[PDB]
Design a protein around this nucleic acid. Structure first.
Length: 498
RNA sequence: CUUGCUCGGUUCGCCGAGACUCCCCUACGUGCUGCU
DNA sequence: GCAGCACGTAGGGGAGAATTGG
DNA sequence: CCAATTC
């Protein structure tokens, strides 16, 4: 039973007015501001919002949060239930911490009592509420508009929707395509392929990029072109696929080509499908991001065919392998010991079902290709280059009393175990706001996933088995282990540890 | 495989290769050693 | 258990749709 | 046609 719904993001093309000014956003912000300030006793009093119209009306009347004109039951149930669950979230954190601590105390003290030692004094368990009645760690306001059934996206129709300069496709008509006859574009026209790179054109299933894509015109050291943005923007808008969400009086228009590519690269749909089916492949409750301009869709329960299991280990591993050998009698394991030198070392095997025990059959080993290692080396160069800059910038912004001590640390004694905390905090703050650091941190994840995908692809070729299993042991060590453990969560492939 | 993102080559006319589980929010923690 | 190192980690909350009633 | 109930 498939139970995983990966996201798919689309771009906002136009708005009636900025998303932060909508009544839904205002009522969400007001509710979030009000609820978090409630004390421990006040939550029980103001915890009867109810899933009905009368209950919601009396909740808004009893308190003083302005409804801001937004009075929709489907949508206020999402705002209130999420907001009160965040209030219980901070309580649940300290509750589970104290539960683990009390289990430790119960084990240790009962063991000592069995040994005759009296139990130690009970520790002052932490409370989530501050001095008078307020939460110490007050939850922050969550900026997001959670769409619902009554405002589900629909294909654009100029008749019943506000007029915008770009056109709108027919919901029932088959969706358009790129340019198949790419080699037939005459010289001097957009998309023209010169007569020197025609032979070494890819034959594989590459994703087709249109000539106005930003990837073909962005600024890199080798690109001696011009990045005129207006021309690319209008050329891209001329061929958009608009879908619209109307919440009350406001509306928003999205570009649906993101959904098209999401269903295309996953292979769930083939070229030649309508917009109605394309929207039917996704949930009718997207999420709007006011800060970026991205609406995030998630696939329906059934669109993807993965199970999203857990990395079982220990005793359950043998039973998992036995059950899988009860399925098609060819299981190809791979061992991912992150050994010396190369970041990845693999060792394929095959096991049968010999009654009760397994019969492993070795099949050899493989190392990472040289191009991938070159890419990893270049990434590490870039990461170290940005690290040597951000650390220096953090050191510069330290207070003079701490700055002198840190300078002495650089100079050549190792002391001052009170400014290490300040250095750590300043470094975390700088890292959280450095855009280049975010880009290089996403690059690490992308490269790690590239390595895992390569290993999975090669482990299906050597063993010639469709179903595979992964064995791991507990720089790139942590990131690669995380990327390999995500396969159970994301793609459903079992991930055994040791 | 039409948008968006990342890395490269160029004759600058665009084509070679990738990831696709993502968001907010609050805390200062996590592993590796040296001695008790 | 209690210091020195590097490096980000940990843990709360999210991410619908059939029906049906005026 | 569109909110409101329900699980």
């Amino acid at each position: 039973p498939a139970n995983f719904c990966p996201p798919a993001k689309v771009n906002i093309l136009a708005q009636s007015r900025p998303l932060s000014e909508w009544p839904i956003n205002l009522v969400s912000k007001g509710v979030q501001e009000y609820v978090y300030g409630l004390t421990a006793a006040e939550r029980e009093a103001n915890g009867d919002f109810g899933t009905s119209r009368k209950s919601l009306d009396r909740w808004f009347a009893r308190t003083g949060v302005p409804t801001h004109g937004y009075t929709t039951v489907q949508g206020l149930n999402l705002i209130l239930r999420h907001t009160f669950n965040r209030y219980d979230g901070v309580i649940k954190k300290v509750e589970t911490r104290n539960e683990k601590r009390r289990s430790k105390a119960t084990r240790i003290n009962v063991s000592r009592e069995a040994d005759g030692l009296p139990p130690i004094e009970a520790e002052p368990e932490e409370t989530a509420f501050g001095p008078d009645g307020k939460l110490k760690e007050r939850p922050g306001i969550n900026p997001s508009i959670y769409c619902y059934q009554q405002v589900s996206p629909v294909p654009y129709n100029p008749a019943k929707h506000p007029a915008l300069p770009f056109s709108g496709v027919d919901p029932g008509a088959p969706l358009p395509l790129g340019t198949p006859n790419r080699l037939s574009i005459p010289k001097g026209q957009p998309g023209y392929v010169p007569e020197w790179q025609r032979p070494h054109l890819s034959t594989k299933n590459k994703r087709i990029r249109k000539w106005y894509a930003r990837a073909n015109w962005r600024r890199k050291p080798g690109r001696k072109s011009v990045l005129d943005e207006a021309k690319l923007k209008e050329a891209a808008l001329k061929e958009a696929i608009p879908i619209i969400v109307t919440i009350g009086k406001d509306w928003i228009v999205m570009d649906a080509r993101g959904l098209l590519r999401a269903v295309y690269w996953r292979g769930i749909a083939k070229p030649g499908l309508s917009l109605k089916e394309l929207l039917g492949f996704f949930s009718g409750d997207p999420v709007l991001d006011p800060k970026r301009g991205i609406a995030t869709f998630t696939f329906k329960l059934g669109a993807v065919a993965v199970h999203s299991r857990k990395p079982t280990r220990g005793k359950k591993s043998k039973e998992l392998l036995l059950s899988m050998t009860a399925e098609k009698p060819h299981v190809g394991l791979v061992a991912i010991d992150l050994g010396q030198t190369n970041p990845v070392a693999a060792e394929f095997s095959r096991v049968k079902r010999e009654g009760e025990t397994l019969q492993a059959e070795p099949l050899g080993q493989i190392v990472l290709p040289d191009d991938l290692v070159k890419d990893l080396t270049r990434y590490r160069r870039a990461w170290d280059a940005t690290e040597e800059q951000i650390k220096a910038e953090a050191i510069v912004q330290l207070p003079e009393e701490c700055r002198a001590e840190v300078v002495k640390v650089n100079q050549m004694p190792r002391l001052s175990q009170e400014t290490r905390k300040a250095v750590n905090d300043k470094t975390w703050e700088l890292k959280r706001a450095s855009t280049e650091y975010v880009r290089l941190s996403r690059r690490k994840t992308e490269l790690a996933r590239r390595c895992v995908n390569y290993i999975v692809r090669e482990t299906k070729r050597w063993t010639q088995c469709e179903d595979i299993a992964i064995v791991i042991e507990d720089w790139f060590i942590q990131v690669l282990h995380k990327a390999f453990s995500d396969l159970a969560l994301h793609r459903g492939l079992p991930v055994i540890e040791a």
